Amino acid sequence: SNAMQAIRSILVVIEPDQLEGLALKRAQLIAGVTQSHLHLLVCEKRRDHSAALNDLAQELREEGYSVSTNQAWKDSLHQTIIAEQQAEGCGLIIKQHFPDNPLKKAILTPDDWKLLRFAPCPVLMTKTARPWTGGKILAAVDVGNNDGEHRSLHAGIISHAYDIAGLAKATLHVISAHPTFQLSETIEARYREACRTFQAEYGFSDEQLHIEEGPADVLIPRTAQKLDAVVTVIGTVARTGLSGALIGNTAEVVLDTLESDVLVLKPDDIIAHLEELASKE
Ligand SMILES: [Cl-]
Ligand SMILES: [Cl-]
Ligand SMILES: [Cl-]
To answer: Which UniProt keywords apply (predicted)?
Structure first.
């Protein structure tokens, strides 16, 4: 329930030429409550943004924030971001989504996909300009699986989601999607007993907990849209797929579809291995 409070530095990706600055707005809301440090990063080689960065940092410090800034560039946008996260030890990366195609506005750019694949920490991809305050926060889990790996991921998802609901004075909602009649009737009864246990463990009301049958890759966005969720918290697949496919189909589809901000968490052992990879560089 305190996963956000426990994040002590946030890497804020600052864009030089856009007309929205949602990454910094989300960071200000969060740090306003958690008092996390904010490290502002511009990823560019050409222009000297130092004066603008200093002015911005001074304004934020006067507002009471702990702030550092930097401008860097090595190789690619996502690589620059991850190198900065490593150098500053940040526990969250916040970046605004800016689609390449105006006709496919929900699809993440290929570079942002690389960021999500390799970041060894939670990544908040902002996708809406709607304020978090008073909104609806949606946590996506699979109550149908309670093995050690899923319990851990789910606990993380709920912890971050609940902490967000708290800091934003918002409400918390949960979606769980799950893919001879006598036997089916018996198996489903047992699945329901497990949902009830999950509901008691996590103190969710019937109204908060959406238990839906069908493909998670459609159910999660359906629920987000119906709730007009402003943030959706999701986990990547517990076990990586072939050829380093560590995001998984559900999260891939959901990230390219949601209109809400998306907080992307990974399994602890995945994070550990990505931490190792990010360190080699
Ligand atoms: Cl941290
Ligand atoms: Cl906000
Ligand atoms: Cl992947």
So the answer is: Cytoplasm
